[model samples]
Target: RILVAVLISGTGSNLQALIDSTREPNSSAQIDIVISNKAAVAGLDKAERAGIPTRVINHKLYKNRVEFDSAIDLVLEEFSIDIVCLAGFMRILSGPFVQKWNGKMLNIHPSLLPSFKGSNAHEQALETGVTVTGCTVHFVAEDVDAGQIILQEAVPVKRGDTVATLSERVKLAEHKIFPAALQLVASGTVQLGENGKICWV
Candidate 1:
């Protein structure tokens, strides 16, 4: 079985979805740990309620981003984590950390990637007057929000939709597809292609 670690910074609805998905009989993966940068995040509580080990590694305690990430790496190694999933982890990792995890780290972004790569993605989509927007789950690369796209689910941007409304739709899609994408990777049915992309077999 693939040992998975999830990072969260907020309410863990998506994390809950992942836990629920792995409860199915034939799941090839399991969440080994759930780590949070903030000690009191609701996600940490959710993980605890589900009986998963939870860790809080606050960035404020470290000297810098590199040091903070190094601390996280140590925890990951201790758990023998096979894959790292960023549900709502708010940190932008450095090159070394990205290289350390490389293909094993995955992230879910709240907009059609290559469109709104950074934060406030839902607001960006609404500001641009786009009719379609969605979420993407991709491998973590050195650059921010630029990685091998593993899966994406597009949601329509309806008229008179606020950022909250559009974000709700995008998040719904995220809840559906993120676990499916991870299952593909765990099953060895998805491979990282030479062109720095994910190829689903």
Candidate 2:
């Protein structure tokens, strides 16, 4: 079984989705810890209510991103966490941090990546007038959201879709795909190729 740690930054709707997914009898994964950089958020509350161990690293106190990540690294090691999930972790990680986990860290992004690669992805999709946009689950690369894709599910844009509307629809897809993508990784069925492609084992 895979022991998982989830990192969140806000409301953690995606975090809730993960917590729900791991409860299934067939799930080969477990959410062993939930960490956040901020406090007094719905995500932390959700983690507490779910009876999962929780921590707040409070990034503002740290001098740099590496220092911030080191604190998280210690917690991860203490738990013997097998996988790291960036559920809603808003901060960009340092290069060394990404390399440390390499294939073991995963992130769920709001856009179809390789498309809208940064913030406001839903808006970027709508602004570009794409009829279809979706979410992606990928391995975390040093470059933001540029990782090899593990899973993607499309959400068609409606005639009058706004960012809010598009995001709502896309999140539904995220909740489904992220868990499955994590399962694939946990089961050793997905591998990242040296050529930066996703390979199914």
Candidate 3:
């Protein structure tokens, strides 16, 4: 079984989804830890309720991004974490950290990716007049949102849709597919190929 660690920076709705998914009888992955960069993030409460071990390594307490990530890495090492899932983790990881985890780190972004890669992805899609926008789960790489795509679920960008509305729909899709993507990685069915592309048979 894969021992997973989740990093979060917000309400942790995605974290909740992961916990819920692992509760299934056939789940091959187990969430060993939930760590957040902020102390006040509500996702910690979700972890507490589910009896998942939780930690907060506040970014402000560290000297720099590298220091903060090192502290986070220390915790992961203690738990012998096999996979790191970024569920709304807001901070950009230093290149060293990204390379350290490489294919073992997974992230779910709020865009189809290689399109609207950064924040406000839904708004960006709407502004760009794209007919469809969605969520993507991919390997964490040195470049932000530039990674080997694992799974993508597309949602239509309706004409009358606001960013909030589009985000809500996309989030629902994320909740469904993120766990699926994690399952794929945990099962070793999805492999990262030589060209930094994900291949599955």
Best by TM-score: 1
The residue pairs in collision within model 2 are none
Which portions of model 1 miss their true places by more than 4 Å?
Answer: none
By TM-score, the better pick of 1 and 3 is 1
Model 3 clash number: 0
Encode model 1's per-residue lDDT on 1-201: one tens digit a residue: 999999999999999999999989999999988899887878888899989998888888877888888889999999999998999989888889888787888888888788987789988887789898888888888877458888888899899998778878788899999999989999989978767777878
Which lDDT value does model 2 have at 54?
90
**TM-score for each model:** 0.95, 0.95, 0.95
Every candidate's CA RMSD = 1.3, 1.4, 1.3
**Candidate lDDT (C-alpha), each:** 0.88, 0.88, 0.88
Better of 1 and 2 by TM-score: 1
